[PDB]
Design a protein around this ligand. Structure first.
Ligand SMILES: CCOC(=O)NCc1ccc(-n2c(S)nnc2-c2cc(C(C)C)c(O)cc2O)cc1
Length: 216
């Protein structure tokens, strides 16, 4: 019965989340580019460590990004085998500590910036609220157990020891609970379109998991 630890977002991050979840910006599909870039960055970090110490890869030898539609749940999962995040990393990097990126980006938006520039401010993760109203971040770093960070775009998030999801081995899986009007991002054809348009230059395989009935 793992303790659910509740934490408060810094005010700036709560402010940014509210802006994104409510914005009517047109090009919502850039969320996927931002999340694939975060995955690629985490994969770059384990590759760097493994160049010196190859044993760091033994927890999951393959380096990949994997997109898993869960149609019945209205959930889109994005998994990577990058370096992952410890419990402390999840609490520190995903809410409690003000990122400079938040304020500068919000000022840029007020001045006319395109929401698509969010990654240039280091806060591209929060673009998921363009298409989702709830997210779980499941992560496993070689230095810690597997943990789940969870938020509903409010001012609070939780961190819980993971006793309910598939083991990642090493890496991170985002579970996006999609809005009711954004279910196109569960479709194979649409996902492929978005990946090919915005994520052509990625050094890791981008795998798409598709479920089909075996016909008679
Ligand atoms: C806190 C917001 O920061 C960002 O939006 N991007 C920078 C970033 C990129 C990768 C990681 N990361 C590391 S280090 N290990 N795993 C990840 C990771 C993080 C995310 C988001 C939750 C930030 C992700 O979608 C995928 C990841 O592999 C952390 C921060």
């Amino acid at each position: 019965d793992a303790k659910v630890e509740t934490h408060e977002f810094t005010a700036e991050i709560s402010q940014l989340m509210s802006l994104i979840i409510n914005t009517v910006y047109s090009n919502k599909e850039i969320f996927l580019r931002e999340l694939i870039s975060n995955a690629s960055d985490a994969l770059d970090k384990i590759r760097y460590q493994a160049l010196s110490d190859p044993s760091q890869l033994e927890s999951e030898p393959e380096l990949f990004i994997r997109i898993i539609p869960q149609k019945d749940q209205k959930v889109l999962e994005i998994r990577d085998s990058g370096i992952g995040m410890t419990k402390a990393d999840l609490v520190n990097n995903l809410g409690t500590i003000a990122k400079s990126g938040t304020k500068s980006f919000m000022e840029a938006l007020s001045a006319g910036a395109d929401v698509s520039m969010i990654g240039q401010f280091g806060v591209g993760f929060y673009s998921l609220f363009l298409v989702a109203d709830h997210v779980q971040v499941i992560s496993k770093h070689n230095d810690d157990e597997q943990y789940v960070w969870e938020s509903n775009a409010g001012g609070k998030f939780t961190v819980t020891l993971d006793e309910t999801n598939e083991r990642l081995g090493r890496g991170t899986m985002l579970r996006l609970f999609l809005k009711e009007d954004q279910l196109e991002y569960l479709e194979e054809k649409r996902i492929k379109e978005v990946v090919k348009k915005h994520s052509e230059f990625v050094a890791y395989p981008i795998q798409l998991v598709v479920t089909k009935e075996v016909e008679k």
